[PDB]
Structure 1
Amino acid sequence: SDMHTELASISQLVIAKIETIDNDILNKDIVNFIMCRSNLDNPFISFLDTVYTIIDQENYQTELINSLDDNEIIDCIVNKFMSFYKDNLENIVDAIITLKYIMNNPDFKTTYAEVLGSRIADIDIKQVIRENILQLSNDIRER
């Protein structure tokens, strides 16, 4: 409801600050987010967090994941992770959130935490983020 002015305003803050941010640090903040530790100081994280919040009215993801067996998880993981090396921001964001919802599972958390850590360390998404953030903002405000 009030999340309109919210999201647009943070977008604007993101694009303004993205370049300046070291990528290694960005990737650390992102991991942390997946692990349910949101450093809101980082605007993009703040962006993510807001978005998550909106989605978790749905809540469906949690139930979904709790059903998945291991092959399904692995498929999910590998499928989602590809977003990062491609150039669609929506799917990147979606991926990240999907990954948090996974790490909210205590079993999957234990198993796959480490690797997510390792593999996120190797992505580079600053371009995608500056280039798409404001458009994404709208796609969702309106969604």
Structure 2
Amino acid sequence: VLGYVSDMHTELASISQLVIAKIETIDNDILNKDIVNFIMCRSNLDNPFISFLDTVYTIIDQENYQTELINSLDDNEIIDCIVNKFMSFYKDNLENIVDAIITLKYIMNNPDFKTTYAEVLGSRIADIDIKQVIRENILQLSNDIRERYLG
């Protein structure tokens, strides 16, 4: 656990406090560009929301299993997944937004789907505004994830 001091319980608690502490200092456009980069596999761990997403990704430690799962979906299932998930960015449920982001990341780990969909995802993520859903729910979400995955 490079770049982690204590356990993941402590880590997810601490990073969730940093998120709420720093969220207003981060311009929406920058936040959204960082999100796109996390999905396209260039983390800017400087952004606490990204460090949060990164840590969550690792905890879910499901990358090999998820690659096989995605590799075996057809194009309709992928389009369906992209479109459904994306609406989370317009709604009020933070778990669903984090989920969307991670799921898009797994889809873009497949080079055929990254080629086809990377540009449209980048363009549309640029128009979202999720700061309120983050402020309102990050602490609770962090608690639920610790209780689910790390108990």
Per the normalisation by structure 1, the TM-score is: 0.97
Q: Is the 8 A contact 2:63 2:106 kept in 1?
A: no
Tell me which of 50, 62, 71 is aligned to 2:55. 50
Moved more, 50-59 or 127-136: 50-59
1:10-29 equivalent positions in 2, closer than 5 A = 10-29=15-34
Deviation at residue 64 of structure 1 after TM alignment: 1.1
The number of aligned residues is 143
Distance 1:56 1:35 in 2: 18
Deviation at 1:62, TM superposition (A): 1.5
Deviations 1:62-109 (A, max 9, x none): 111111111110000000001010000000000000000000001001
Q: Percent identity?
A: 100
TM (norm. structure 2) is: 0.92
Change (3 A) 1:137 1:99: same
* Unmatched tracts of structure 2, length 5 or more: 1-5
Q: Distance in 2 between matches of 1:110 and 1:12?
A: 36
Query: Alignment RMSD, CA only?
Result: 1.2
Give unmatched runs, 5+ long, in structure 1.
Answer: none
CA offset digits 1:22-75 (Å, max 9, x no partner):
000000000000011110000000000000011124743211111111111000
